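Predict the assembly for these two chains.
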Amino acid sequence: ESTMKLVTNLSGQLSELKDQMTEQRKQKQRIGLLGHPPH
Amino acid sequence: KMVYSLVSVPEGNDISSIFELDPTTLRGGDSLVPRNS
């Protein structure tokens, strides 16, 4: 179960980089769409 | 050729007075900005 450290960290990082790129896309959902509508 | 210069404006709702912070050293986009960085 101390070997579960490396077993679960690979899962944690593989989940989290996808989560952070999805969160970057979500940040785009706001920042890009803020400057798109005209005046 | 400096096309743009910084001035003072009384109006606030315009988007022309919107800025972004770029750290000197790369940092994540979901991190708390330190007070003196």
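Chain B has no helices and no strands. The radius of gyration of chain B is 14 Å.
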